[PDB]
Amino acid sequence: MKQVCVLGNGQLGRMLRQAGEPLGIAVWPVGLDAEPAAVPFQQSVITAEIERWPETALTRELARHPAFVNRDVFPIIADRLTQKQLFDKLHLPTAPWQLLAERSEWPAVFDRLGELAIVKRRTGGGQWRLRANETEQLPAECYGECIVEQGINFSGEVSLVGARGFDGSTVFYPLTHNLHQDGILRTSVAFPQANAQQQARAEEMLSAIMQELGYVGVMAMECFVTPQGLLINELAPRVHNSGHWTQNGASISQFELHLRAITDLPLPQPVVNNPSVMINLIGSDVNYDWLKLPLVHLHWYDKEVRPGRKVGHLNLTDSDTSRLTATLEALIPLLPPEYASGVIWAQSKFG
Amino acid sequence: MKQVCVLGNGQLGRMLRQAGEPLGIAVWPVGLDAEPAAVPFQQSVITAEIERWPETALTRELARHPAFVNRDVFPIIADRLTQKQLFDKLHLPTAPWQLLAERSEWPAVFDRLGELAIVKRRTGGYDGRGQWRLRANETEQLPAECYGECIVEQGINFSGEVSLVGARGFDGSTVFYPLTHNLHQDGILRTSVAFPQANAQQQARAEEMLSAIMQELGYVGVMAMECFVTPQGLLINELAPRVHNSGHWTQNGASISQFELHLRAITDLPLPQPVVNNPSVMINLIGSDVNYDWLKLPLVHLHWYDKEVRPGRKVGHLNLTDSDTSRLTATLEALIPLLPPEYASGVIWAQSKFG
């Protein structure tokens, strides 16, 4: 048979497993605490839903696996420094960055970057927006452990989701409009036909990247939409949240796409006929009333509900835009008030 | 939580389970062999993927549990006899029939029914199995074991076959999918095609018939009605008190799949009318191995049952759906060569419907 093991017990793994079953592919998602003896790792291909991991007996063994795809790619991506660096080596648009070592760097820093400064964690994610006077508002921890970027005034956020096969073939989904709030992805909108020039450009970028990396499987690229054009923000070496829509909006979902690649399967270009809307469910309980709207696709992760925690998502796709928008509106009252903003935002796209 | 136990380990149970997962509904498909203790039956809604079952300590337990939905409806449907009587009682159009009680009845039988005599087993006949097409000279060709255990219907000459899949909620509400065109070969379903917009009159008449049925039985869940298309109109062939192979296209071709729809019904979840925007085609994979090459075609949706491949056995299906019929048909072509010869007929047939 076809057998895969996924490093990580998360919802992504879950979704990957779900995607594989019908395909005859057996996915065994697995947590770091996992004993080597419980995983059939010795007989499968390995993938991961996580960028980095502790050194356990298992992870240790996976260190010498002739089948841990992209195993060595991770480390570069895992680190925001080397990542940013990667962009630089490729001559790909990105926000002016520096490593934040000394406090003895601040003056210049606020000099290079200007007014506002955005700081993030090199690893494990993680973002502080400081000004010339907030400078001591930050931990000393972040010294040579955090990066520093120019505050970017973008007009929109987009994400590019695609895959590269073992033969270098690549496929892409259309660009996805993303809405973050309090640094969390709240809402996504995907149009069957994105802006040609935008799409092309992004594809160029993502491809340069994946090939330079030698990357195999699905990877996502977060970008900013600027008057000066697109700028790469972040890279995710795995299926990404902003593509969850593909489960019901494309002929091949991302999870599927991933599996295909790593399992040496056909990687044709997925069909996308209609727009989709994804609603992230953050720290809310399941309201089966949502299921009254026929266009709604509930994806419940089955995790303990808790504040700020991603517990599921709602997938909405249809041919009728009216029907599509009416569903959204009807949703408002079925969701806690904090959801209203995103819903509306998405709604605004169909105007 | 939301927990469901399914009497039966088959592909249907599997698909129900898959369908439930993202909904937060745990489904436990149970093998007949299974020890009762081992099933979370006491704290779940019970359902079944089979019409009938042997007397096992397992079935004994389950069948007796007040949680078993439609438990009583089963016996009536499982027996072609009682099922036929039900159509009658409902005054629903169906092939003229009779119970084959005694040999000395043959003469009479041929009197009413005509030339061709289609004999069917009352119980246990899944894929045109225990069924005989006999003539006045062939009667001796039929097992004696059938006397009283089988019925006879008049050979029906139909333009085509269609199945209606729908559901009834605890609250009497009902939903339906568009009529599905079916192609049986060697008494086996090979292919189905659905159109977003079936024949209104035909669609409505079938629906009227399905409801009367479900209502009359107070059925709660997905049920499928097989009909023959004839000159006079539609005739009820068979009923399926459960998710049916002919509905497999709903998995990828409807906003709510028949699996999803069945779990919703039984757990008392909302049951709005599924949204169907395009046509779809389902291809049944019989006794054939998996060909991942099939996946070369972006519109193909593989459904592998993970069973042991055997001749005449249902190992999976291929769903194909799309707004662009040409793409659709061009896909179908592209598959012919990907499938073993026996498949070509179905395909072309399928193809034949878009033209």
Ligand SMILES: Nc1ncnc2c1ncn2[C@@H]1O[C@H](COP(=O)(O)OP(=O)(O)O)[C@@H](O)[C@H]1O
């Ligand atoms: N340099 C920047 N200028 C403006 N906004 C930014 C900048 N960097 C990040 N953001 C904002 O922070 C969000 C999340 O930041 P990021 O660190 O890239 O992702 P994550 O928190 O998901 O790991 C962005 O998607 C955007 O709202």
Ligand SMILES: Nc1ncnc2c1ncn2[C@@H]1O[C@H](COP(=O)(O)OP(=O)(O)O)[C@@H](O)[C@H]1O
């Ligand atoms: N009275 C009849 N006249 C003509 N064809 C019939 C008749 N009864 C059954 N058939 C044929 O046999 C097929 C399968 O038989 P059926 O008993 O209805 O289902 P199954 O054996 O699959 O449970 C039908 O789909 C049809 O092609």
Ligand SMILES: [Mg+2]
């Ligand atoms: Mg982000």
Ligand SMILES: [Mg+2]
């Ligand atoms: Mg039948």
